[PDB]
Ligand SMILES: Nc1nc2c(ncn2[C@@H]2O[C@H](COP(=O)(O)OP(=O)(O)O)[C@@H](O)[C@H]2O)c(=O)[nH]1
């Protein structure tokens with residue numbers, strides 16, 4: 075009934091999707107293996123969606139923007155899924171799907187859930203965010219960064235480096251007392267994006283203003299998301315980026331499988347503090363501690 | 376004579392350093408092991424130096440700045456080593472040491488060379504730079520980024536993300552027709568550093584101007600390097616950063632040892648293109664290709 079579970083998802087049965095999602099989220103050894111066979115069957119029905127990541131600090135307005143962008147999209151004929159690596163009026167619609175979420179684990183489960191959703195007819199996948207930003211950037215076509223409409227304080231609370239992940243930057247809460255400040259805060263971020271992408275010819279991250287609580291700027295945000303994709307498609311980079319993500323994910327799964335044998339080893343985990351204390355104190359070289367970790371892992375595996 | 380090779384390096388014998396460096400750079404299995412024992416003996420004589428990384432695009436002026444900074448330091452009583460991951464007038468001095476350089480390999484060899492040099496009495500280590508910037512940032516106390524004194528073009532050619540590695544940013548070639556442009560180019564970079572470190576309280580990367588060919592700005596660069604260190608020491612972060620680098624390096628060596636069994640496997644390497652082509656075409660899931668890579672590695676090891 076895995077062959078059966080695949081025709082039901084592809085045919086649009088909507089009690090079968092939660093179950094296939096449950097199967098994909100399971101890690102019991104018997105489940106991963108059928109989860110794999112299902113994905114394999116549904117994979118050629120995937121890929122026909124725009125995957126958008128969305129990040130920014132708690133309270134920047136992420137879930138308010140997603141709810142509104144979700145409504146905007148549904149009213150335009152899309153079927154929208156929201157995943158997390160809050161929004162009630164979205165969740166009511168028969169054309170929306172909202173599901174709540176170890177980074178390797180949740181990445182795997184999210185990634186595999188996307189294949190299911192795309193096979194199931196969803197054409198827009200919104201994925202909301204520790205090292206979780208990179209993980210989501212690596213599984214989406216357009217990575218969106220929401221920031222604060224405060225001149226000199228846009229990236230408050232943002233891990234450094236995250237700005238370079240963004241295909242689009244959005245100065246949110248451009249309302250109330252900060253209509254004019256929003257514009258200046260945006261122009262400040264543009265200036266910086268211009269220094270970080272000084273001779274980019276294909277896509278330099280545009281910076282938008284938004285008021286996700288007043289529903290202002292979501293349409294323009296989406297117009298920009300579509301534009302990102304027409305630009306990348308016209309240069310052959312859109313499929314090229316996806317194929318490169320799937321190859322990097324493959325090598326990452328290989329990396330995780332082979333390193334978890336070590337990291338996950340109980341003996342390695344008891345002895346870890348002491349070998350580290352010794353390294354930090356220069357009582358032991360890192361090559362020698364590394365060897366000891368390996369010998370020990372190898373004795374108890 | 377490994378116990379002998381350690382008292383000769385620590386005592387300041389200067390034909391013994393090249394030889395210990397040669398021993399540390401060797402990967403023949405019999406050599407790594409004595410290299411380790413030597414490092415272990417010299418490790419308590421290391422740590423008494425300021426390690427500075429230096430990066431920027433080819434032609435930005437790196438090796439001209441290093442030669443001049445080197446002379447500045449030697450005339451002030453330091454013993455200076457330069458490593459690379461060009462400068463002849465430096466290389467003549469009995470208080471300078473210049474040595475030319477697989478990323479894991481060259482990182483290991485550089486890192487181990489630093490211990491030797493510090494044991495040998497060198498108190499300033501300059502390390503000049505693919506993913507080589509992160510590697511050097513992870514092995515130094517102060518990471519310096521040289522950029523161009525061109526308004527709107529400072530980071531031309533720089534991999535994105537590298538700006539967030541810098542403890543210090545230096546607008547170089549602030550001479551000739553660009554004295555005033557240099558000042559503005561610097562103020563542009565300050566504005567961006569201010570957006571990326573909007574509420575930093577301990578150390579916000581200062582941005583300096585320099586003319587490394589006219590010997591202008593090197594002294595101020597070094598004053599800033601020393602200041603970086605007094606600031607970090609006053610907060611207990613200077614040793615804390617070093618100890619965290621040695622622990623991360625340990626886990627990296629463990630990661631490299633365990634993954635090279637796979638990556639380095641000849642059979643894995645023949646079959647790689649085809650498994651990738653299959654992943655990129657959606658003929659195969661990444662979890663299933665990952666498994667096939669592992670089974671195959673495991674059959675031929
Ligand atoms: N003034 C203003 N408040 C907003 C805006 N968007 C969200 N908020 C408020 O900020 C708080 C957090 O918003 P939320 O969507 O939950 O942010 P999240 O943590 O990123 O999901 C809520 O009280 C929202 O009403 C906006 O555009 N303007």
Ligand SMILES: Nc1nc2c(ncn2[C@@H]2O[C@H](COP(=O)(O)OP(=O)(O)O)[C@@H](O)[C@H]2O)c(=O)[nH]1
Nearest residue numbers: 432433434435436437438439547548586587588
């Ligand atoms: N005008 C000017 N030229 C410089 C400066 N520093 C280096 N150069 C020139 O730029 C070229 C490359 O300098 P170099 O030190 O080799 O750069 P590197 O590739 O980063 O090592 C040489 O012709 C230098 O003379 C400077 O401050 N001003």
